[PDB]
Symmetry: C14
């Protein structure tokens, strides 16, 4: 939506539709105060993800993973957010009867 999403959505909206640049599909298991993830390069300001406070640590490339695992369920929360370029593919299917996490996303993210 805006630069910094800064939003609990509350849930999905009038996602300001775009070309894939500014807006990214931040969604996947989320909630844990993520203003926006991706953009801007200025302070989102920052997010926790996975409704946890774990996140991956090794560096993939320049841009490099993070991956809170939420529950025991499949919780491949990635946010390769370095602030270089940026590729991540989320999916989600936890407690099968959930608040539909099923659909999965991918994020592109140029800052440039």
């Amino acid at each position: 939506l805006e630069v910094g999403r800064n939003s609990p959505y509350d849930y999905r909206i009038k996602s300001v539709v775009y070309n894939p640049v500014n807006v990214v599909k931040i969604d996947a298991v989320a909630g844990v105060a993520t203003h926006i993830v991706v953009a801007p390069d200025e302070t989102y300001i920052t997010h926790a993800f996975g409704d946890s406070e774990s996140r991956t640590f090794a560096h993939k490339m320049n841009h490099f993973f993070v991956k809170p695992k939420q529950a025991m369920s499949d919780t491949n929360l990635v946010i390769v957010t370095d602030k270089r370029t940026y590729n991540i593919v989320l999916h989600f299917i936890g407690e099968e009867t959930k608040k539909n996490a099923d659909g999965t996303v991918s994020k592109s993210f140029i800052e440039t």
Copy 2:
């Protein structure tokens, strides 16, 4: 009604009748603070649907589904609201003795 419906109806009204553009038939199992869905392209502002906080996640087309399932009952809450164009067909028949959900709608939605 208005641009942003912004309304709990309270229930159906003097729906400002139209050609199918601005006003859409948002109805179906609803309640969970949906100001308006569809229009405007400006902030409705946003809705939850299904009286839940689930919603579909895969992307259908540009404009792409969302589908909170309310109860266990037939709860095909769709709102393909991308903000491209827009096609969705709702129906509803849950707890058969309900607050008549029976009648079902369809939404058109050009923003253009």
Copy 3:
């Protein structure tokens, strides 16, 4: 009475008698904050009917039904209020010893 009836009657009054245009016979099982139904085309503002919050959903014609069923009794609360033209025929006979619902109405309704 006025444009927007806006009234709990309290009960029937000096119904401003008319030709069938402005004033309509809103009556039938009612109570659930119906200001006026029918007219105006401007905000009545809106009504619930049937002392419920059910109402019919399919679209009859342009102008199209709504029908809260109040109790289990015969509760054919119709308000075909679209805001096109408008035809509905109410009747009422619930708990036979009631607050006389027996007499039944019909509503005409041109906005034009």
Copy 4:
């Protein structure tokens, strides 16, 4: 008395005697906030009758009945108040030892 009687009488008074036009004999089982019935054509403002909130519903003629039945007793509360012309004949004899309802009235009522 006045235009709008607007009165709990408290009980019968110096009924401003007339020709049968303005003042009508509103009396019969009453109490339930009837300001005046009949006249004026302007807001009485309105009455309940029968110390109930039932009233007849079918339309007799233009001017047309209403008839709260008070108790189980003979309670032919009519007020054919349309605001056309107007004919009604009340009588009353409920719990035989009552607050004398025995005497019965008739109402004329031209607005013209």
Copy 5:
């Protein structure tokens, strides 16, 4: 006494003696806020009688009865107060040992 007696007497007084016009003998079983009965033609303002709230209902003549019966005792409370002319004859003898109701009155009453 005055135009509108407007008085609980408290009990009988210096009844402003007259010719039978203005002052009438209102007395008989009374108490229930009768300002004055009879005169004036302007607002007494009004009375209940019989220490009840019953009163006769049929119309005798133009001027026409009212008759709260107080107790079971002989309680011929008449006030034929129409505001035409006016004839009534009260008497009283209830609980024989009472607050002497024995003596009985008659009321004349021209308004003219």
Copy 6:
């Protein structure tokens, strides 16, 4: 004493002695807020007598009796107070050991 005695005496005083006109002998069983009885013709203002609220009712002459009976004892409380002329003869002998009621009075009373 004064025009309107207006007094609980407290008990007998310097009765302003007279010719029998203005001052009358109001005494006999009394107490029940009698300002003055008799004079003036203007508002005494009024009395109850007999320490009761009974009083005679028939009309003797123009001026005409009233007679609260106090107790069961001999309680011939008369006050023929019409405001014409005026004759009454009181006596008193109740509970023989009383607050001496024994002595009895007579009242004259011209207003003229």
Copy 7:
């Protein structure tokens, strides 16, 4: 003492000695708020006597008795106070051991 004695004495004093005119010997069983008895002709203001509220009632002459009897004892409280002329003879001997009532008085009393 003064015109109106107006006094509880408290008890006997410097009785302003006189010729028998103004001051009278009011004494005898007393107490019950007697300002002065006798004089003046203006408001004493008034007395009760006998520490009671009985007093004689018949009229002796113009000036005429009053006689509260105090107790059962000899209590010939006279005050022939009319406000004509005036003769009374008191004596007193009640509960023989009393607050000496023994001595007895006489009152003269010209107003003239």
Copy 8:
């Protein structure tokens, strides 16, 4: 002492010694608010004596006794105080062990 002694002594003092005129020997059983007895002729103001409220009643001469008897003991409290001339002889011997009442007085008293 002064004109009106006006004093509880508290007890005997610097009795302003005199010739027997102004000051008198008021003493004897006393206490009961006697300002002064005797003089002046103006308001002492007054005394009770005998620590009682009895006092003699017959008239001796012009000036004439009063005699509260205090206790059962010898209590010849005299105060012949008329306000003519004046002779009295007190003595005292009550409860033999008392607050010495033994010594006895006499009072002269010219006002002249």
Copy 9:
């Protein structure tokens, strides 16, 4: 000391020594608010003596005794204080172990 001693001593002091005129030896059993006894001729102001309120009563001479007896012990409290001339001889020996009353005094007292 001063004119009016006016003092509880507290106890004996710098008795302003004199010739026997002004200051007198007031002492003996004392305490009961004696300001000064003897002098002045103006208000001491007055004393009680003997820590009692008894005092002698007969008149000795012009100047004449008073004699509260304090306890049962020898308590010849004299104060012949008339305010003529003045002779008294006190002594004291009560409860033999006392607050030494033993020593005894004499008082002279000219006022002249």
Copy 10:
């Protein structure tokens, strides 16, 4: 020390040493609010002695003893304080283990 010692010492001090005139040796069993004894001739102001309120009473000479005895012990508290000249010899030896009273004094005392 000063004129009026006026002091609880608190205990012995820098006794302003002298010739025996002004300062005297007041000491011996003392305490009972003795400001100073002896001097001045003006108000010490006064003392009690002996921690009692006994003191001798006879007159020795002009200047003359006083002698509170404190306890049962040897308590020859003398203060011959007249305010003439003045001789006294104190000693002290009470409860042998005391607050050393042993040492004894003598007082001279000219006022002159």
Copy 11:
């Protein structure tokens, strides 16, 4: 991020990407109020590490280790922060199911 990170992250962000100079990878088991570690040379201000308050003590080189060990788990918290140059290699794998500590970092750090 900034000079002094001064931040609880809250968790990893839009790490202002760099060349390895200013920003360092402070991460590893942390939390214990570390504003920033490394840079600036001005007051970070300072950190605790290891969520403890242990840290290594020997000096490695100029720049020299510190190493809080957090738990019993592998907790090689190094911060060779001298403020010379600076080399440290962290890794982390404690309670294997943790908040992913797995990924490990290295810090470069020139101040120059």
Copy 12:
């Protein structure tokens, strides 16, 4: 120290060293509010000694002893303080394990 020591020391100090004149060695068992002893000749102001309120009483010479004995122990508290010249020798050895009283003093004391 100062003129009037006026001090609880608190304990020994920078005793302003002297020739033996002004400062004296006041010490020995002390405490009981001794400002200074000895000097000045002006108000120390005064001391108690011996932590008692005993002190010697006889007069040695002009300057003359005082000697509170503190406990049962050897407590030769002397202060020959007259304010002439002055010689005293204290020593102290009470409860052998004390707050060292052992060392003993001597006081010289010229005022001159």
Copy 13:
């Protein structure tokens, strides 16, 4: 860091690196309000060490030891802080599992 460290570190920081002059390695078991130790020569202000309040007492050289021993463990807390020159070598290894005290320091310290 600063002149007076004045700091609880909180723990080790951006130790302002130096030549060994100003900053010293104060560390070793510490905590007990040591602002800085060593420098400055002006008020650190001062330290306790060893988290105790013991410290060595003999004088080594000019500059001379102090050595609180903390626990029973090896606690060679030295601070030879005289403020001459200055040599001390700390080490630490107490409760082997501690908050790493293991690493040990040495302090140089010229003030010059």
Copy 14:
């Protein structure tokens, strides 16, 4: 340190190093509000020592001992503080495991 140390140290500091004049080594068992001991010659102000309130009493020389013994342990607290010259040698070794008292001092002290 300063003239008057005036300090609880808190413990040993940046003892302002000196030649042995001003600063002295006050230390040894101390605590009991010693501002400074030794210097200045002006008010330290004063000390207690030994954490007691004993101190030696005999005079050694001009300058002369004082010696609170603290506990039962070896507690040779000397402070020969006269304020002449001054020599004292402290040592300390009480409860062997103490807050190191072991090291012992010596004090020089010229005031000159």
